[PDB]
Amino acid sequence: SLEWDNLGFSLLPWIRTGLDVMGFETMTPVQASTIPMLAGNKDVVVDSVTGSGKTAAFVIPVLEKVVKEEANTSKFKKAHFHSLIIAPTRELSRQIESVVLSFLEHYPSDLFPIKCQLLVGTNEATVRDDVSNFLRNRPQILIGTPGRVLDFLQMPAVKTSACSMVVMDEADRLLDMSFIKDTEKILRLLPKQRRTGLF
RNA sequence: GAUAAGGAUUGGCUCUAAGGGUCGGGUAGUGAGGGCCUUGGUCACGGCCUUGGCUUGCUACAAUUAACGAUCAACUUAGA
Q1: What CATH number does the domain containing A135 carry?
Q2: What CA–CA distance (Å, rounded) separates A3 from A186?
Q3: Is the C or the N end of chain A the one with fewer CB within 10 Å?
Q4: Domain of A82?
Q5: Is any atom of nucleic acid chain B found less than 7 Å from the CB of residue A198?
Q6: Around Cβ A129, how many Cβ atoms within 10 Å?
């Protein structure tokens, strides 16, 4: 059908509003076959052509899971996060973060906010600045490259126990021989019982 | 001992945390401060009150590959 209205789990009104303002005029086959399952207690391994709605395909289920598990509430603890997103290059992670910000533009007020933080290797911010504003702003989404997110997670001030969603974009590149050393540690730190999406 | 070698001309892959600290960018206009001047009254070369002409601030165009440069501080042969 490729219609947003007739999907299995009736996407949230603000996510639907963001989709309509952005458009796409419909949902692509990737987003039609991945969103129902990645939010439905199934890990996902997705192969698709470039520019086929993959980024939204793994961003919408992330927000759905964040809202579903009561991550956007006062009950959520400090120095904890919900979802992690990993990409092999800094520009790709920044672009993913921009997409997430665009989706969160239409997030309603009068509720506990949902935020994201980008963790890339930069000369404008040490890892301790990242820890400081992570503690202050309390986001639920982390997006970054393997090196800086590994350094961030290794800091004792950050607790990974509440994470329930890991996404690896360009997962063939992140499981490459060069990247496997860092990603093995990154996944070693995080809890095993989780939902994984490789794209 | 990592990093392709170890008498030779050593410089050696892509992406991915950090790689000692610090400082520094133009040309123009007008306000400010200092410096040399100078002009009157005033008190025995020196004060007092007044008159007209290197640092920094605000605006207007180039540069944003400063992806450069400067300075301070560290360091020596793992071979038997």
Answers
A1: 3.40.50.300
A2: 37
A3: N
A4: 13-199
A5: no
A6: 11
